[PDB]
């Protein structure tokens, strides 16, 4: 009943490749297409709702998620991994920013925090 | 509070500050801490304002009754002891009093008695009483001589209060000076510490620490 | 402080005075004691002002995250439960006394909560040093089936009773109305019955009145190029 | 008041008493004489609470001077010490007691003998060859136990007293500003002006 | 014994037309003993000014803390912190020591660089924000300052008039407090210039 | 120095155009025990004065005897005892105020708050307060204890300043007093439903009303209140 | 334990002019956070062109004023209707206060009138009877809010003449009764804004050679 | 506070006044002191309102989780959970709780949990500040196997007296009836119970 | 201590338990707390046994001297003398006395004098530590103008309950009947009153 | 520990610190050096609670000596004083605070300037021309306010210091057994062996 994996599962191969990151990028490649376009007075993000069954209610599955009132996110790759990242991203916007400065984080810094969470899954045990 | 009195060739110099505080709040900057008991005797106010004021005014009444009955000026020894014996009767009740009884008679010459609310009565040459007493003592002890002139002695007393007024938070406002002679006391004015400090700084070259 | 809450036909109204004091001294004459927890859940605060702001913002933050997690608009009972369990844990050391009101998919609600963690249900409530003055007005004029206009009137009258009769309360009346199926309308300085009269004299000084020893420019800019 | 010492030698009693008067933060005086002549051959030194010490001493002085005039006669040191003890013993159960400790050094002209009496504020009297009050005994008694002889001269008594004062000046934390020394013998009371 | 009145001192801040002013005395004491006449109580992090009264060790500690935090803020945000944002940082930082607080009375003053709007704020020792339009007072003579400011202040004063008003408010308040005085400093703050003036006052 | 044992709660009062109204409940509490339910705390003195007393009841009974003794004493060698030399509210008050301050100054107070309500010889309304400390004050509305916190705010809405007194009728004033007594019954834990009310009018004289009850109470809304938050049943 | 003292709030202000004197006081009486009265007179005409106020614990304040008024009456009986001069009144009040040195009147007393040369006079007392003649004196709750303002606007403290830069002080020019009343009203308006115990009404008693006159002004009631 | 729970032929009835005080001020005059921890297990609350609400909420959580796993809990089980919290946290709690419930097997049961955290199964129980005044009345007038109407009258009369003498008690008399038939709420106003 | 006095048609009856305690030890289990200050004026004593005995002895002295000069005192007069002692020495006394007496003019009268030294004329009065438990019972069961047998039963049942619940009360129930017929003492033992 | 004084002159800092160590009744030592060299041009004198004073001083000494070896560089007096302040400021909210007051006298070799820092047990730092801790300032500051000049020589600084010590010896009740005096300048630290 122990967590004995205190060592990295992502390591450098002889060629300098980080295998698990490359393989994660391959999983992203298989994922459904999503895009983003920046205008002068706005930004748009879009994706296909690839419904796994017609009996499924695809409205209940949100691929595009509000992170803060002025920030939104969309993905390609593994949906469950996205869902938990959105939960962590929403919470980190509050704990490491809003509860300190009384305002929502700017886009680049929230992105920085999400990036940090993803980096740690690339080096932690 | 800073009050002082000292004996010299020319009689007694009495010098006091003028500040009164209730906690941190400065209630008055125009308090008279020298009680003019009569034309020949002076008292200083430290400890309780009411206690010093009331009983040293009363002392003046007793000194007046003495000279009516005895047809002679009361001695400083006798005047001081009337006050010390009175406060000693009240010992324990909570009077607060630190005073110098200052006078100049024929038989005694210039005389200062430190009188105090727990019964102490001490004759002496130099006394300082109050929250700023230690600061005044420094200036006095290093510059005091018996053969000071009346002009220099008045300045020394003024300067010693200024020293305390600067450092002690509960002393300041203004300096009141008196010179006690055998023919009576002579008032030597009220001197604002604010104006006095800058004047003394420039003329004396002291207080280099302070920017002016 | 005087704070009240009053239920009505289709919602709930809360109100508060605008005086903050340190001992007998008035620190802010136009303080805002009405706090948003979520768009349609607001509370009026009394007690230690740092504690009331902190506890509202913490629960408001966790309520927002809960709303995003569940894809549902927040409920007043959730704000109440989270507030009370937090306050109970700190055994009254967080000196927050709150009147929590709002509308949600369940309906309109009005609760009070005290620093030790006890909660209360009612149609009309008051809290703070002016609560007895306020409750006197509420006990005299409250009825069942109040309209929106009657509830705003009653609530602001109850705050006025605090303003005029309680030394801990003063200045203005803030109101917030939370009606079912509508946006909550925050009415900041709804009443202003304590404007200071014009002074007898202008105290603007002649220029050069103050004695100056030194002048210098303070560099607020960053290290410059070239 | 701090240190008061007493030593009875062959033909005199020597009292040594500190000169400092401290009121809390500052030393207000460094030449205070903590003694009163009660009669021509009886001296009393004193130490205790401020005000009470002098009030008590002068009250005793007045009563012994009154006795002297009434009877045209000097009371023996023993008689004076008994009177003083009774006044202190009366004092201890009063509303507000005198907090005063005394040494009474006297020369009994009838018996031709010096006599030293130690009386504390409670009215605890003891006749001794040497005595002290407060902490003074703690530093000095080991030296007095060692060197004291009943047949000492006045000059030998003063030298032993200098050793006691030196030990006090070394090991006591307080600066008591030296001592005034007075000798009581058949010829009366006199002050040693250089010590 | 009371930590907030061991060292003594005061801060006052005021708003004017397109400007703010913040001012403080220079005394540091150990109760009755005057120790320093050069203890400045106003600090700045970019264009945001912070006055701090109270226990002097905590004044120094909080200055070092907010310098630390605003430096990291600037490196990450790539811009200087604004008064409104800083005020929330001060509040958060104080409240995180709710049950072992810094014994201080902070005062924020500055102009928002984007909107040009004058801003002042004050706090109790645990971080309750007072965001006044008119003025903020702090320290051992806060009662005296409240009295001065309430009568002397009028809105929309020009920078050089505001200087006179705040100076006379500080000076006359300090002269009625044993634990304040020993010199004074006044900052007049405009959108892109700040003037600092040392005042001449009684040294008792 | 003592502690109060058997106690009476709020006394409330106000001025109206032609006189004064005063009221107080009929309870003598023994801490949290509602011990005695038939205690009269309004004590009339002649036909022009009513003294309302709260606080310690044994001290109230002592004061009651002093007032009775005062009437006897005023009648001695006084042919005008029921005319020009009758006791005034102002005389009765000043006497009590003297006694209260003297007793506090010997560190042995009468543990009470007293309101003297009446009408003077010239028709002027008299209403003034005194307590165990000898503190005195007058106002268009006066109340003791809880009444101060809850009754005064309600009564001040009717008579907010001196100029509102001539505009206030006896019907409006009594209504305000009766409503205040209901509010105190809702909210004061040491109050009772039964109370006494006295009106002293310059035309119609002293009307003393015993055995009044708080009525028209609102409790129905209580049925709809369930739990303390989440409970629906 | 029985506490014989209480705090009824209030704030008072005495100012001595060249040939007049004013003694002002708010009319609010309080205990804790409750208002007892919005109009309870605190400043009293005591006869002989003397006005008095004893601010603090209202019962001790009423007792002292009552005793002083009586002292004026008995002074007339004992000394052939002689007018009690303001300095003599002040000394008499010291003895009244010091008489209770070990159970004090918990009040800050101020009196105002004219001295024997017709010049304005104000005297100020502590609870146990230490006293001093003064030009300007606020007492009570909001005294710390009023006195700094008066130092600045009556005595022109910290004000210097423009152009000299600290070298020449603003000269101490004499204020009229109308000017003093403006400063009194503004002191109490400001005090009302920032002190919870100050408000409701302001009653000013003005003393001149012609007698004692009263003026009343409304203050904020919150 | 005056609270009681009384077993009778068909089950059990909980009764309570509605007054909550802070000192002499009545903070709430329409309080509900009868609170539900399960469909047919309720309690009467006395002592610290924060403590008894915090405890009751935890119990309701424990019995909800019990029900998900093991089906309906007994009244004895509910009393045990209350006791565990009250006993183990006796140093930091001021709670006096009466637990009352209806099984079909056991019928009406009443358990009282005083300050110490002890448990006492009784035919009826009284508690709260106002209970002191009705020990005599309740002991003389209680019978076992009363009807519903008799038991309502017994609780109504008892709490009427508790309210009359105790300043800390007052307002409305709330009652909750627990039987096989279901859960019935009753309320009785001052004009009704005062004249009894 | 549990004590009471009750007026009825023919006069008045005083009742009391017999227990005196020092801490938890019963110092006297057969105490007589019904004490005579005049032929037909008696009292019930509660509080400090030294104080109430000292007071009663002084009252008996005052009424004996009253009788020598002015004839038989009223019950109101006896209550007034009790009050005077209790009120004027309130700081140094712990006494709770019920005064009960029979005139032919006034018939049965009862006055209660609690700790403060106030007086309260009542149809009946209860006092002592055990009285708290029977406020409810006594209020529900007292009627005016009861017969002698009904009043004895009312006191017996009341003090039976007071004894049952109060540890400070116990032993025998003593009673003293005051009527035109004279003075009757009654006693009731544990085996009698416990089974009621 | 009792008296510690500091004075910054033209080209040096002078620290004067009392020699007495008193444990209640007796003076256990009269030659105690209440100072530690933190670096070659930085000296720290200290006074406060017994045990804590030396423990703190030696702990600071070790940390500065560690810094010196690691970087092969002497920290500026300002840097050393800031480090010391933070340690005391950390200490005041601890389970058991260091009750220690310090003066840090240093010569900054970069700026060619003497520097004196006064830090109390709370972590209250001030840079001064002259400073003291405890009651020492009460007696000496009036003399220093009067006579001090920023351009004084070391010999003038020592003479002003003698006047301060004389005033202390006159008016203080405690016998602090004189002072050890040390000078901090460009050449390092040296002790004035005759004072
Ligand atoms: Mg100052
Ligand atoms: Mg000063
Ligand atoms: Mg108000
Ligand atoms: Mg028993």
């Amino acid at each position: 009943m122990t967590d004995r994996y205190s060592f990295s599962l992502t390591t450098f191969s002889p060629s300098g490749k980080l295998g698990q990151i490359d393989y994660a990028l391959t999983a992203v490649k298989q994922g459904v297409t999503s895009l983003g376009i920046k205008a002068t007075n706005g930004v748009v993000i879009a994706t296909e709702k690839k419904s796994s069954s017609p009996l499924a209610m695809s409205e209940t599955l949100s691929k595009v998620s509000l992170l803060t009132p002025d920030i939104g996110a969309v993905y390609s790759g593994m949906g469950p991994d996205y869902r938990v990242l959105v939960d962590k991203s929403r919470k980190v916007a509050h704990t490491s920013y809003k509860r300190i400065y009384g305002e929502y984080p700017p886009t680049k810094l929230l992105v920085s925090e999400v990036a940090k969470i993803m980096q740690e899954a690339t080096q932690s045990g | 509070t800073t009050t002082l009195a000292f004996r010299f060739q020319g009689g007694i110099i009495v010098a006091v500050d003028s500040r009164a505080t209730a906690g941190n709040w400065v209630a008055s900057q125009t308090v008279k801490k020298v009680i003019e008991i009569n034309p020949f005797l002076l008292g200083t106010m430290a400890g309780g304002a009411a206690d010093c004021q009331f009983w040293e005014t009363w002392l003046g009444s007793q000194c007046r009754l003495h000279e009516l009955r005895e047809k002679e000026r009361i001695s400083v020894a006798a005047a001081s002891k009337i006050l010390s014996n009175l406060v000693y009767q009240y010992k324990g009740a909570g009077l607060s009093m630190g005073t110098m009884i200052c006078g100049y008679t024929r038989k005694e010459g210039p005389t200062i008695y430190y009188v105090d609310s727990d019964g102490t009565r001490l004759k002496g040459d130099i006394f300082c009483v109050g929250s700023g007493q230690t600061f005044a003592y420094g200036v006095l002890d290093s510059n005091y001589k018996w053969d000071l002139s009346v002009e220099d002695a008045l300045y020394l007393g003024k300067r010693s209060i200024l020293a305390a007024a600067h450092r002690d938070a509960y002393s300041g406002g203004s300096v009141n000076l008196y010179h006690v002679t055998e023919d009576g006391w002579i008032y030597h004015g009220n001197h604002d510490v604010g104006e006095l400090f800058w004047k003394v700084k420039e003329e004396e070259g002291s207080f280099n620490n302070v920017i002016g | 402080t005087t704070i009240v809450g009053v239920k009505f036909n289709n919602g709930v109204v809360i109100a508060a005075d605008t005086r903050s004091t340190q001992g007998p001294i008035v620190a802010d004459k136009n303080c805002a004691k009405l706090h948003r927890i979520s768009p349609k859940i607001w509370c009026a605060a009394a007690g230690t002002a740092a504690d009331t702001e902190a506890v509202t913002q913490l629960i408001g933050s966790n309520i927002e995250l809960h709303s995003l997690y569940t894809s549902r608009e927040p409920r007043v009972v959730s704000a109440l439960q989270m507030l009370k369990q937090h306050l109970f844990k700190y055994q009254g050391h967080i000196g927050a006394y709150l009147i929590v009101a709002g509308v949600d998919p369940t309906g309109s609600h009005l609760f009070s909560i005290h620093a030790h963690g006890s909660t209360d249900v009612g149609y009309y409530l008051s809290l703070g040093s002016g609560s007895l003055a306020a409750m006197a007005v509420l006990e005299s004029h409250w009825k069942q089936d109040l309209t929106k206009e009657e509830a705003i009137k009653l609530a602001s009258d109850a705050i006025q009773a605090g303003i005029w009769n309680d030394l801990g309360s003063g200045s203005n009346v803030d109101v917030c109305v939370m009606e079912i199926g509508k946006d909550a309308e925050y009415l900041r300085n709804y009443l202003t019955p304590n404007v200071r009269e014009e002074k007898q004299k202008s105290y603007k000084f002649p220029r050069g009145t103050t004695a100056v020893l030194k002048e210098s420019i303070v560099n607020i800019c960053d290290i410059q190029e070239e | 008041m701090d240190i008061i010492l007493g030593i009875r030698v062959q033909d005199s009693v020597i009292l040594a008493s500190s000169k400092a008067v401290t009121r809390g933060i500052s030393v207000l005086k460094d030449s205070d004489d903590k003694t009163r002549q009660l009669s021509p051959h009886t001296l009393m030194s004193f130490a205790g609470e401020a005000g009470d010490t002098v009030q008590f001493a002068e009250y005793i002085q007045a009563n012994i001077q009154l006795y002297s005039i009434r009877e045209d006669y000097e009371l023996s040191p023993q008689a004076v010490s008994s009177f003083v003890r009774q006044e202190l013993a009366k004092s201890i159960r009063s509303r507000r007691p005198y907090q005063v400790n005394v040494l009474i050094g006297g020369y009994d002209k009838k018996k031709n003998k010096p006599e030293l009496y130690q009386i504390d504020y409670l009215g605890t009297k003891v006749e001794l060859p040497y005595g002290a009050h407060g902490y003074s005994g703690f530093y000095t008694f080991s030296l007095l136990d060692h060197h004291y002889r009943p047949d000492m001269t006045t000059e030998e008594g003063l030298d032993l007293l200098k050793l006691c004062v030196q030990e006090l000046e070394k090991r006591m934390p307080m600066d008591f500003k030296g001592v005034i020394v007075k000798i009581v013998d058949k010829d009366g009371i006199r002050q040693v002006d250089d010590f | 014994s009371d930590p907030s009145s061991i060292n003594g001192g005061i801060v006052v801040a005021m708003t004017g037309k397109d400007c703010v002013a913040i001012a403080c005395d220079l005394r540091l004491g150990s109760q009755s003993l005057g120790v320093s006449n050069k203890f400045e109580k106003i600090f700045h992090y970019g264009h945001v000014f912070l006055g701090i009264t109270g226990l002097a060790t905590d004044v120094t500690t909080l200055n070092e803390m907010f310098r630390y935090k605003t430096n990291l803020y600037k490196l990450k945000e790539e811009r200087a912190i604004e008064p409104e944002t800083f005020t929330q940082l001060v509040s958060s930082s104080l409240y995180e020591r709710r049950f072992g607080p810094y014994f201080v009375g902070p005062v924020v003053a500055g102009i928002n660089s984007k909107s040009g709007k004058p801003f002042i704020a004050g706090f109790d020792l645990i971080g309750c924000i007072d965001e006044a339009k008119d003025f903020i007072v702090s320290g051992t003579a806060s009662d005296q300052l409240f009295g001065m400011c309430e009568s002397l202040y009028e809105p929309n004063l020009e920078p050089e008039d505001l200087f006179e008003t705040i100076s006379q408010a500080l000076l006359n308040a300090a002269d009625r407090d044993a634990l304040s005085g020993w010199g004074a400093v006044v900052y007049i703050i405009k959108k892109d210039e700040v003037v600092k003036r040392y005042l001449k006052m009684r040294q008792d | 120095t003592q502690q109060p044992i058997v106690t009476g709660t709020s006394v409330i009062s106000m001025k109206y155009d032609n006189g004064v109204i005063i009221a107080a409940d009929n309870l003598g509490s023994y801490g949290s025990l509602l011990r005695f339910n038939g205690v009269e705390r309004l004590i009339p003195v002649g036909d022009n004065t009513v003294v309302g007393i709260s606080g310690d009841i044994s001290d109230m009974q002592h004061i009651e005897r002093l007032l009775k003794d005062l009437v006897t004493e005023n009648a001695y060698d006084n042919p005008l005892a029921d005319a020009e030399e009758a006791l005034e509210p102002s005389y009765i008050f000043e006497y009590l105020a003297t006694v209260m301050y003297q007793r506090r100054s010997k560190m042995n107070p009468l543990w009470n708050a007293i309101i003297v309500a009446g009408v003077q010889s010239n028709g002027d309304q008299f209403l003034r307060y005194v307590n165990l400390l000898g503190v005195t004050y007058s106002s268009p509305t006066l109340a003791t204890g809880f009444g101060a916190h809850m009754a005064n705010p309600l009564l001040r809405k009717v008579v907010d300043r001196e100029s509102d007194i001539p505009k206030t009728t006896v019907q409006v004033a009594e209504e305000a007093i009766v409503n205040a007594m209901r509010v105190l019954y809702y909210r004061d834990a040491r109050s009772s439903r039964n109370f006494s009310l006295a009106i002293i009018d310059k035309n119609t004289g002293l009307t003393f009303k015993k055995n009044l009850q708080v009525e028209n109470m609102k409790w129905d809304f209580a049925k709809d209140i369930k739990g303390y938050g989440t409970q629906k049943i | 334990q029985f506490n014989p003292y209480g705090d009824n709030g209030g704030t008072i202000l005495g100012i001595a002019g060249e040939d007049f004197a004013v003694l002002a006081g708010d009319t609010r009486n309080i205990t804790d956070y409750s208002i007892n009265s919005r109009y309870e007179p605190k400043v009293f005409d005591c006869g002989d062109n003397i006005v008095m106020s004893a601010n603090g614990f209202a019962a001790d304040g009423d007792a002292l004023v009552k005793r002083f008024k009586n002292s004026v009456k008995w002074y007339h009986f004992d000394h052939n209707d002689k007018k009690l001069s303001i300095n003599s009144a002040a000394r008499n009040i010291q003895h009244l206060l010091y008489g209770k040195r070990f159970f004090p009147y918990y009040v800050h007393t101020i009196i105002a009138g004219l001295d024997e040369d017709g010049k304005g006079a104000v005297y100020s007392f502590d609870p146990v009877g230490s006293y001093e003649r003064e030009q300007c004196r606020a007492g009570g709750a909001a005294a710390s809010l009023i006195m700094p303002f008066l130092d600045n606007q009556v005595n022109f403290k910290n004000q210097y003449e423009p152009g000299t830069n600290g070298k020449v002080k603003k000269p101490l020019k004499y204020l009229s009764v109308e000017e003093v009343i403006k400063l009194v009203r503004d002191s109490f308006t400001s005090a009302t804004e920032r002190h919870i115990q100050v408000g409701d009404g302001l009653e000013i008693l003005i003393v001149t050679k012609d007698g004692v006159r009263k003026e009343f002004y409304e203050l904020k009631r919150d | 506070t005056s609270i009681m729970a009384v077993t009778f032929k068909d089950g059990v009835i909980l009764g309570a006044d509605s007054r909550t005080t802070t000192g002499a001020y009545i903070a709430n005059r329409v309080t509900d002191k009868l609170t539900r921890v399960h469909d047919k297990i309720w309690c009467c609350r006395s002592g610290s309102a924060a403590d008894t609400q915090a405890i009751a909420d935890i119990v309701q959580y424990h019995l909800e989780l019990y029900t998900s796993q093991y089906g309906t809990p007994s009244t004895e089980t509910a009393a045990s959970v209350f006791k565990e919290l009250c006993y183990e946290n006796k140093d930091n709690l001021t709670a006096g709780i009466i637990v009352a419930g209806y099984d079909d097997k056991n019928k009406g049961e009443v358990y009282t949990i005083p300050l110490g955290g002890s448990v006492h199964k009784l035919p009826y129980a009284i508690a709260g500040s106002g209970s002191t005044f009705i020990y005599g009345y309740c002991d003389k007038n209680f019978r076992e196997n009363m009807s519903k109407e008799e038991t309502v009258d017994f609780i109504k009369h008892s709490l009427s007296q508790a309210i009359k003498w105790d300043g800390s008690s007052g307002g409305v008399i709330r009652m909750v009836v627990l039987t096989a038939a279901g859960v019935e709420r009753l309320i009785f106003y001052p004009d009704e119970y005062e004249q009894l």
Side-chain angles (χ1 to χ4, degrees), chain E:
Chain E
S1 185
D2 173 36
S4 56
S5 59
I6 288 165
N7 301 128
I10 43 165
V11 172
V12 58
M14 287 189 179
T15 59
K17 183 159 191 74
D18 305 310
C19 69
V20 288
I22 186 158
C24 74
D25 77 319
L26 293 173
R27 191 173 175 279
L28 186 142
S30 290
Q31 289 165 303
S32 70
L33 181 64
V35 177
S36 182
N37 54 212
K38 287 166 175 71
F39 193 74
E40 297 198 16
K41 294 167 192 85
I42 298 163
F43 314 93
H44 61 92
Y45 317 101
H47 66 271
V48 181
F49 286 74
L50 176 66
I52 319 166
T53 62
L55 193 68
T57 184
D58 292 346
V59 167
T60 307
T61 294
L62 283 178
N63 176 38
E64 291 166 357
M65 196 183 74
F66 294 127
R67 182 179 62 179
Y68 179 114
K69 289 183 177 190
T70 54
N71 281 352
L72 293 177
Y73 181 94
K74 195 178 178 196
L75 291 160
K76 295 160 80 169
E77 300 266 353
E78 295 172 301
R79 65 182 186 83
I81 196 161
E82 299 295 341
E84 292 90 336
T85 315
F86 184 70
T87 293
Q88 295 300 134
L89 180 59
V90 172
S91 179
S92 299
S93 301
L94 294 172
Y95 198 84
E96 97 191 324
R97 299 274 185 279
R98 176 58 179 79
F99 300 115
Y102 296 111
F103 299 103
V104 298
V107 182
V108 169
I111 294 159
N112 192 283
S113 71
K114 200 143 188 288
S115 79
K117 194 169 176 285
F119 183 96
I120 55 172
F123 320 75
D124 65 5
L125 81 174
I126 52 165
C128 180
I129 305 165
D130 171 12
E131 190 182 321
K133 280 277 171 68
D134 45 15
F135 54 86
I136 295 293
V137 303
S138 180
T140 48
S142 60
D143 291 17
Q144 292 92 316
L145 283 165
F146 269 127
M148 289 305 296
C149 293
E150 195 58 58
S151 40
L152 294 192
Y153 184 85
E154 58 186 62
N156 297 127
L157 287 164
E158 291 292 327
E160 295 182 29
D161 296 315
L162 184 64
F163 169 73
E164 299 295 334
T165 304
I166 196 165
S167 293
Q168 294 296 317
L170 191 156
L171 261 28
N172 292 294
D175 292 0
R176 283 282 175 181
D177 184 26
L179 310 185
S180 295
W182 261 23
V185 185
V186 181
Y187 290 79
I188 304 302
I189 300 156
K190 290 157 73 184
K191 195 172 179 179
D192 40 26
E193 72 162 289
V194 177
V195 186
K196 184 187 182 180
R197 297 204 184 77
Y198 290 77
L199 307 182
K200 186 161 194 166
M201 69 177 293
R202 65 192 300 118
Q203 299 294 309
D204 63 346

Side-chain angles (χ1 to χ4, degrees), chain D residues 8-169:
Chain D
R8 164 176 64 74
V9 298
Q10 180 83 291
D11 63 337
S12 64
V13 188
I14 306 163
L15 297 189
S17 311
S18 43
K19 285 193 268 180
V21 181
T22 308
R23 287 295 173 271
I25 188 160
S26 294
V27 181
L28 295 191
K29 207 178 174 181
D30 58 356
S31 65
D32 186 61
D33 192 4
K34 299 171 177 47
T35 209
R36 295 298 144 119
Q37 180 174 131
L38 310 184
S39 69
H41 306 94
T42 310
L43 185 67
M44 190 173 74
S45 69
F46 47 83
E49 211 202 325
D52 292 305
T53 46
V54 176
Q55 284 284 162
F56 181 79
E58 290 179 8
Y59 167 79
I60 294 299
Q61 187 178 53
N63 276 102
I64 304 305
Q65 286 176 11
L66 179 58
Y67 193 100
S68 291
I69 291 292
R70 192 187 293 117
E71 311 306 328
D72 195 32
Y73 197 79
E74 186 174 19
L75 279 166
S76 66
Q78 195 290 130
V80 172
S81 70
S82 291
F83 173 78
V84 170
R85 195 204 82 80
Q86 187 176 63
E87 292 295 304
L88 294 165
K90 174 205 270 79
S91 158
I92 201 61
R93 287 157 199 285
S94 306
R95 191 183 58 76
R96 198 189 64 74
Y98 288 112
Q99 254 96 102
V100 189
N101 303 297
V102 302
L103 296 173
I104 293 164
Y107 192 88
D108 195 315
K109 296 284 281 182
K110 174 172 262 73
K111 302 212 298 292
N112 294 301
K113 270 174 152 63
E115 285 177 3
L116 176 62
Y117 294 99
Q118 183 188 115
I119 311 169
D120 71 11
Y121 75 105
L122 304 174
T124 316
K125 191 176 95 169
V126 178
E127 201 281 323
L128 293 169
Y130 43 86
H133 278 293
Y135 291 112
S136 309
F138 282 84
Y139 300 101
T140 61
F141 286 162
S142 59
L143 295 169
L144 292 157
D145 287 345
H146 187 80
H147 288 111
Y148 178 78
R149 294 177 290 100
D151 72 325
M152 288 173 96
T153 58
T154 306
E155 298 90 61
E156 289 168 342
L158 292 166
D159 288 337
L160 178 50
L161 204 69
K162 280 182 175 171
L163 189 65
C164 287
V165 172
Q166 283 163 352
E167 178 60 18
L168 285 163
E169 287 176 353

